[PDB]
Amino acid sequence: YAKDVKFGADARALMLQGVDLLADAVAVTMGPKGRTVIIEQSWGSPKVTKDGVTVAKSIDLKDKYKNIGAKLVQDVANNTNEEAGDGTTTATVLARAIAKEGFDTISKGANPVEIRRGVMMAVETVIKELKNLSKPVTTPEEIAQVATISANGDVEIGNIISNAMKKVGRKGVITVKDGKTLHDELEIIEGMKFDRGYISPYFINTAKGQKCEFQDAYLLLSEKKISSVQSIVPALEIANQHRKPLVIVAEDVDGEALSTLVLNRLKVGLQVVAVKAPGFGDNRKNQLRDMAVATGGTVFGLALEDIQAHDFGKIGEVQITKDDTLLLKGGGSPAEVEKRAAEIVEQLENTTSDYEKEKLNERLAKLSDGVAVLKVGGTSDVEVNEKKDRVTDALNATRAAVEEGIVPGGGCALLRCIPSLDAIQTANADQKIGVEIIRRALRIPAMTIAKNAGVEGSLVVEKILQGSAELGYDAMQGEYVNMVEKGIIDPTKVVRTALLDAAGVASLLSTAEAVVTEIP
Amino acid sequence: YAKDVKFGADARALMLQGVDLLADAVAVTMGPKGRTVIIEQSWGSPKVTKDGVTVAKSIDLKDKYKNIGAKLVQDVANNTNEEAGDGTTTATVLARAIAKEGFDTISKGANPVEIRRGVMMAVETVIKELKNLSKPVTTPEEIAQVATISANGDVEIGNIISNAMKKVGRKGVITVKDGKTLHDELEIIEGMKFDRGYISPYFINTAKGQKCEFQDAYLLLSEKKISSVQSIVPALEIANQHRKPLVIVAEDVDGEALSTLVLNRLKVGLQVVAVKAPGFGDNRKNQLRDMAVATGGTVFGGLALEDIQAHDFGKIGEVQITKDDTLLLKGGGSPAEVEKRAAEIVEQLENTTSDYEKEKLNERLAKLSDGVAVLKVGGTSDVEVNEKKDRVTDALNATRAAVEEGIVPGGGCALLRCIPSLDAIQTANADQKIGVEIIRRALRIPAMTIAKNAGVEGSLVVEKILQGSAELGYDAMQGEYVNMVEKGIIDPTKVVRTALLDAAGVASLLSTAEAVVTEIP
Amino acid sequence: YAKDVKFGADARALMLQGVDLLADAVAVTMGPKGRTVIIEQSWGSPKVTKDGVTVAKSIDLKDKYKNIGAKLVQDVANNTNEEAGDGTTTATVLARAIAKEGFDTISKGANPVEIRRGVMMAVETVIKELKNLSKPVTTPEEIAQVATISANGDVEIGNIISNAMKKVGRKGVITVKDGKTLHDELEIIEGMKFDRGYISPYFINTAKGQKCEFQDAYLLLSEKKISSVQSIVPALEIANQHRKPLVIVAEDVDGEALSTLVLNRLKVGLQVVAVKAPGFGDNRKNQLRDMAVATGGTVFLALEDIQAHDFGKIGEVQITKDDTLLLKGGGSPAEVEKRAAEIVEQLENTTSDYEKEKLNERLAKLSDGVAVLKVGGTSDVEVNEKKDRVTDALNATRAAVEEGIVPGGGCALLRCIPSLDAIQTANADQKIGVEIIRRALRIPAMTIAKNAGVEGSLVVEKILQGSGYDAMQGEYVNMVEKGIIDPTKVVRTALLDAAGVASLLSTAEAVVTEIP
């Protein structure tokens, strides 16, 4: 239980060493000419990868302080990845640059608060000019073009993504699953997606995604919090006797019930997953009722322990990831669900609250609008799985592009925001120092990509900055071209979130004046 | 079992090094512009915080003597926090300053007794002039203003705090809990509060922190000391049969009964919490009877144990038991049962003449009649509700302290304004003057630390405040010398007074130690 | 848990040292005059071998980075061996040469991308010239000559291999098995072969390769995936009551069913082997039904009610990681030619080329049986040794049929050097990579000469400046007609795999290893 504490510059230097190691490992994968990282496995052949995310996840340091810094940067870059589908490497390298420059300037006597205030000013200016620079993607032709670009010249993949988006909309739900047909195809089916994940890991998938994948499962709905084991044993035995998976949607599953669910999940292989009910307040119960009528079940909170297996709903397929749950095939009657929406539209014409209208319309969309499942084809199952990974990545990229537009790739989007930093109303010298830190960091992504391509980063950056507009550097072909015209693009959401999160983590490391670790 | 013993300044140096490490960790969080402390969690991500309390709670050194010093200062600061609601960081930094300067002067040959005499003298002078400087908070409008200030400019939180305090009084019972509604609201229900905690760890909610809370529980009250398993098994099985938690209130629960209650709770999962009966002497029996009639149960003292028929149990809708107090919320007792029990107390109030029995009789009557005000915080997200509950709890404790002892200018500027007060002290010898100078240097430390964490140099800021008017301090958030009382930069007088008193006490205790005995590792 | 990472040339040097050790061990076995490697065994006398493959498989280093490099090269060379049947040593030595030269040039300031672009250009040019150099083997006389040459001047082995290939075609199925007769003989029996392996290690034949080789086995076929123990217990009970092995061909066996199956064979020896159903989509179901009618079983109405009339019969089955052989069928012939009539009727109507290929492949599986080679002899030990030799000769002959033959002794690569002089290089680094490949091309012949006793520095120059150094004879002859040949597929795949692994090692800028 012993502790060791370091203070100020001494601790920040160790954490900076950790982030230096992490970003040195990650940055070699940047750009189309990214290099290879070899990661030793516990068993089998070593892993060869150019993926920044898997490289960052594999890094773990022995010394406590540098490990702490690396873990902080890893968490920030990872939550950047989960939002936009990319930008882990960009966030990591930007964070290292900003943290290094800030620690060097602070350790020489600069005021940390007046540096963070000014680093944030430059970041805000860069974000504003980046949003000004973004080219929106709204038309189906633009969507197909972006999807094909993210699919690396696959016209079929871009066309199927564009058709799915046209058929369910930009706000619609799109998922990709393994296809058993030689040709990829999409279809619109009923469905329901809410942003609540599993309470604790019950991965039956036990594979990529860290989710749960049942098929032909039961649905147990309860407004009451389920904590008594005696009130949940009958449901578990009813589900087990029919050998169907059970999905428990309650306000909260905890205590003895959660303990028994975990024990049975790992001892007798019980296929049960507990997920918190979506929403809050009275909207929780309305969403539960809507879900129950969609699945043809009933809600408890009926004594909750007298289940007769007619109380359960039916779920054809369910996918429960960390922060959201997808219910695919409902068991409720179409006449049942169409009448439930009638109540919602009746309440729409009466209630006029802005907050109440949004929730009711979202429930209406959940009941009426379905999900779009596109299945990826191929001549072999491993080809189908690899194409599934590629199509998922392209779909996330296209969703980000529709959300926030596109900007020139190769790090040139951040490079073209440099001239906007020369007109910031800075108060004192430390604010200018922070702005200069951000300005120096803006060149890091493009320079790293150039270095990975083999050419010198400084000269390429100088030519791009002192050259014609929209003239970037295509590393794969080794020539200065128009990036957006020739398709070298990145989603604006990716770069914006990466820069914002890197600045946030760097400022968090700059605010740390003491680090407490455990004596090994 | 071997022991190592160090003497005098040699051991005091190690203990001072420990408190130096602890206070250096804590002080970086001081002030509204405080810095960040990273605490490595054993499992999961590192913990990033600016709270001095959790920073001090997480420090535990390797060497025995410095760990002893750190633990002493931690305990003093922690018991400062429990009584007032804040001042852990202030107490820690003041304690380190006083201990450092006292050890330096004493080790140079000064008399420690005649230094502590004079440190305490100037502490008394500072406290007197602080009470003189304190502005009382008595009117409901002032209470609402203070609550809104403490809630960081949220009008509804201040209004709801002021409404609750108005509805139950300044001496009344207020607790904050999670709310399921989007809108925050307060209501007054029956209740009972007494300063007795759990006998042994029974924490159902470890996340809440050393609290044992559940709903719809049975209650058995025993005048006799429950120490036999045979007499408590029937009650336990009766409570288990109905799937209801059991609360044991008795003169003392110990021995094999306590051992079985702890072991079965840890292993099987018994929903049982044992709490010592409140009061002492003949009053303990009287308020045990009062609790029984308030909850609808009966007192055991043919009314022996192992004869419970579940009609001898009191019913409690909600119970919260913490380390230092217990809260029974919803009583199952009949309203007519309790409205005629208070008649007995009133009748005894005519007979009593001790002028102290009447105080306890009135306290029992108030406990029977006065309820508790529960206010549930609203929000659009459950996590938002939890965080707002924490914020409202902190604001409510600050407002309670302010009502108790008034308010003073914040940012440690009250201690800054008490500096000229001690220039006129009848010092006997030089050592008393030395102690007075030690405390004078200490008085500037909180404001200087807040300024340093803000970025600016505190040495110039303190002198600028001292040489200027008696109303302009330092914002340190806007970096402007402002009228802090009018602008809203205030601190409760109770918090600062207790912080200074406890820091002086722990420094004196650390400077009276002439021998430290540790165990050979 | 804790990780240690090295960057750039520092890590590439450790990996190069590891591959240096591995290739130094392997290269002493190259050529007809290859030297001897003694590998210590856990029990018994040490193993004395001149085989590059077994020496390479017996290398494991203590330091993390050099072991990582050695294992990368090992895996590349091994999967080179599994495709063509030879070239492990060739691939290893070429990989070491290319990696050494490339690392030395890169560490001195060259651009790795502009080196790999140009190394691959030279490799492609060498491949084109090698395919130009190859003499195709298509006639039965040439097939017999190649088989006899591979069999070390064994006329009978060459004759039997050539006859088997003639009787089942060059695309046919040929397997080698121990013979109980004094004289080796072949026969064509009904049989089936598809590229699907065991889901989990199930080897009852622990030695002589990783094989599941039992006889007189039941066969169940399931279109749906099998993951429930409730749906597989009846099959196991039925198979165990009759003391007959069970082969499971399904879409996928995983989860509780797979765990129960793998645990049972370990503890009681259930004699159960599972294998994923071959193919994809509709072709999977069609050929699953074809297999069912070939074995007499039925496809799976559920997995609970099975009995035994729904069980295909397999006389002999051999399952490796990449392919499954079902030797003896159980279905009635009137059932199998009736199914073939439907296949030819469907082929008579369809005109798509891609769909006709799978139809004819299914028809060949149904009708064209497999060919077995029983190897004769006077002792079981000699029969097994001859079986190993004949299997090697058959693999070499089939590779030669695939892509022709080229002069052996490393001369095939040596004769592509003069054709490397005409390459349009963009910059100096591409020329440097071309030079790396050019220097590496001499390495196999040089190693063979060095192991033969003579020094290859003069041997290579004599071979080039003239009109090939048979190492065993010691005289420069024309290797092709003399008999010193290698399959063109072997050298092509070895060169390509060595270049690929060397490029992969050159593109590595960071190695992440675990703290010991």
Author numbering:
A (entry chain B): 26 to 326, 332 to 550
B (entry chain A): 26 to 326, 331 to 550
C (entry chain C): 26 to 325, 332 to 498, 502 to 550
What do the authors of the reporting publication say about this deposited model?
Mitochondrial Hsp60 (mtHsp60) plays a crucial role in maintaining the proper folding of proteins in the mitochondria. mtHsp60 self-assembles into a ring-shaped heptamer, which can further form a double-ring tetradecamer in the presence of ATP and mtHsp10. The crystal structure of mtHsp60 reveals three domains: apical, intermediate, and equatorial domains. The equatorial domain connects the subunits in the heptameric ring and facilitates interactions between the two rings of tetradecamers. Our results showed that the E. coioides mtHsp60 (EcHsp60) forms dimers that are incapable of hydrolyzing ATP but can reassemble into heptamers, thus restoring ATPase activity.
As an alternative, we truncated the highly dynamic C-terminal GGM repeats of naïve EcHsp60 (Δ527–552), based on the crystallographic study of human mtHsp60. The resulting truncated protein, called naïve EcHsp60ΔC, was purified as a stable heptameric complex at both 4°C and RT. Importantly, the heptameric naïve EcHsp60ΔC showed similar ATPase activity to the WT naïve EcHsp607, indicating that the C-terminal truncation did not significantly affect the protein structure. The crystal structure of naïve EcHsp607 showed a typical heptameric, single-ring conformation in an asymmetric unit. Unlike the partially disordered equatorial domain of naïve EcHsp602, most regions of naïve EcHsp607 could be observed in the electron density maps, except for the N-terminal MIS and two C-terminal residues (residues 525–526). The β1/β16 strands form a strong interaction with the β2/β3 strands of the neighboring protomer and stabilize the heptameric complex. The thermal parameter distribution of the naïve EcHsp607 coordinate showed relatively low b-factor values in the equatorial domain compared with the apical and intermediate domains, suggesting that the equatorial domain is stabilized upon forming the heptameric conformation. The α4 helix of naïve EcHsp607 was found to be folded into the core region of the equatorial domain with α1, α5, α16, and α20, whereas in naïve EcHsp602, the α4 helix extended out from the equatorial domain and interacts with the neighboring subunit. In naïve EcHsp607, the ATP-binding motif, DGTTT, is located in the N-terminus of α4 helix and forms a pocket with G414 and D494.
